[PDB]
Amino acid sequence: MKLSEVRKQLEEARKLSPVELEKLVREKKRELMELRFQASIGQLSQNHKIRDLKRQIARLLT
RNA sequence: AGAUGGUAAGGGCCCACGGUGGAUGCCUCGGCACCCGAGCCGAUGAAGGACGUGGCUACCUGCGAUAAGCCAGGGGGAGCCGG
Numbered sequence: 001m002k003l004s005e006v007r008k009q010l011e012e013a014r015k016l017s018p019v020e021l022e023k024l025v026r027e028k029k030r031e032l033m034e035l036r037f038q039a040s041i042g043q044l045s046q047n048h049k050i051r052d053l054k055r056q057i058a059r060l061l062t
Numbered sequence: 063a064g065a066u067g068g069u070a071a072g073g074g075c076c077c078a079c080g081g082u083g084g085a086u087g088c089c090u091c092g093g094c095a096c097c098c099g100a101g102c103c104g105a106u107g108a109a110g111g112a113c114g115u116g117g118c119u120a121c122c123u124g125c126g127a128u129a130a131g132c133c134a135g136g137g138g139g140a141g142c143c144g145g
């Protein structure tokens with residue numbers, strides 16, 4: 001389900017949409033690096049975090 | 063004075079049981095022929111590729127930095143994150 005709650009308001013992100021969507025896409029991309037960094041060091045990441053964070057940015061990126 | 067036994071280093075034929083080898087039978091995811099259908103793609107970048115892409119990924123498959131995937135419509139009704 002996750003998606004709906006998000007993707008719905010992701011469109012609703014039409015307050016300052018495209019611009020806020022760029023800003024948003026970045027924070028989502030920084031959180032990703034932090035993740036692959038912590039996953040890099042070994043015990044400090046638990047999988048799906050990255051997958052879900054990726055696919056999020058993909059629709060987020062629309 | 064004479065006469066004729068035994069020995070098998072090894073060999074040979076036969077029997078039994080194995081080793082090696084992959085014939086024979088059965089099998090079939092594939093192939094073959096015919097018939098019917100269907101018949102163009104490309105600068106809106108084709109055909110075909112290269113390098114990438116998974117939390118751990120050698121290869122195959124998929125995909126393309128939104129990267130085994132994103133959106134929506136339809137199908138479907140308990141399982142799902144390919145091999």
Ligand SMILES: [Mg+2]
Binds near residue numbers: 003
């Ligand atoms: Mg989805």
Ligand SMILES: [Mg+2]
């Ligand atoms: Mg005598």
Ligand SMILES: [Mg+2]
Binds near residue numbers: 067
């Ligand atoms: Mg005698």
Ligand SMILES: [Mg+2]
Binds near residue numbers: 070
């Ligand atoms: Mg003998």
Ligand SMILES: [Mg+2]
């Ligand atoms: Mg002897």
Ligand SMILES: [Mg+2]
């Ligand atoms: Mg002997």
Ligand SMILES: [Mg+2]
Binds near residue numbers: 079080
């Ligand atoms: Mg025996």
Ligand SMILES: [Mg+2]
């Ligand atoms: Mg034999």
Ligand SMILES: [Mg+2]
């Ligand atoms: Mg034999």
Ligand SMILES: [Mg+2]
Binds near residue numbers: 092
């Ligand atoms: Mg066949």
Ligand SMILES: [Mg+2]
């Ligand atoms: Mg043309």
Ligand SMILES: [Mg+2]
């Ligand atoms: Mg191609």
Ligand SMILES: [Mg+2]
């Ligand atoms: Mg590949």
Ligand SMILES: [Mg+2]
């Ligand atoms: Mg697909």
